[PDB]
Every structure is written in structure tokens, then in C-alpha cells.
Amino acid sequence: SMNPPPPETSNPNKPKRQTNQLQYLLRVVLKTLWKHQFAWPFQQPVDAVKLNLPDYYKIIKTPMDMGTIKKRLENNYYWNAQECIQDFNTMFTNCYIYNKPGDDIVLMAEALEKLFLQKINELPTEE
């Protein structure tokens, strides 16, 4: 049964906050990366069935994607900005683990990550 269940995006008993940093993560970081020409393979979980990659989820045990991140930000899933930043980093790292240097998907990930790092550098102070 080739795809795992997707990451959780809803959990009513998990404590949540709305912080100005989490707002920036949705309105600046996510928005910018989402509309990028290279965003599309990252906008939902890797579909190992569709791609015929039966080894994907043998290799990647902590999957993450921007579709998941978008839903987490829109539905106020997080306690802090660092949880969300960790999700972006997991997404990029997984890509580098599974694939090889110079593969198209890696080039795409690198371009998104450069942008991500540019925006995270301007993360607002926690008010």
C-alpha cells in the first residue's frame, strides 16, 4: 500500500499560537515560495504511486511538503515559528537525501531554499 498517510495538519488538543513570526511565515515566506515557477513538485506530498517510486518512503521516513505546510499555517497548527521552519528544512533535506546532485528536482529545491533563506533572514522579532 504504497503511499503513507500524509503528515498531520489538524490536532485539536495540540496547543497553538498565532505569532507575528508565524504570520510572516504564511504571508511572506510561504506565499513567495508557493508562486515560484519551481514550486509545483513541492505543493503536495510525494506521490510514490504516481511516480512509480516504490523506494521513496523506504528512504524518507519524515516526509514534508509545502501543501502540508500551507495547511498547517492556514489552520494555526503551530506553537512557534521554529516548528514551521523545521518543516521547510525537512522538505529540502529529504529532497537532497533521496535524489542526486544536479538532478532537476534538486536544482528546484536549491532555488526554493535560497529564497527561503533570504526571507528567513528577515524574520521579524517576536512581539
Ligand SMILES: CCOC(=O)Nc1cc(-c2ccc(C)c(NS(C)(=O)=O)c2)nn2c(C)nnc12
Ligand atoms: C529518481 C527519480 O526521483 C524523482 O523523481 N524525485 C522526485 C520527483 C518529484 C516529482 C516529480 C513530478 C511530479 C509530477 C511530482 N508530483 S507529486 C508531488 O504529486 O509527487 C513530484 N518530486 N520529488 C521531491 C519533492 N523529491 N524528490 C522528488
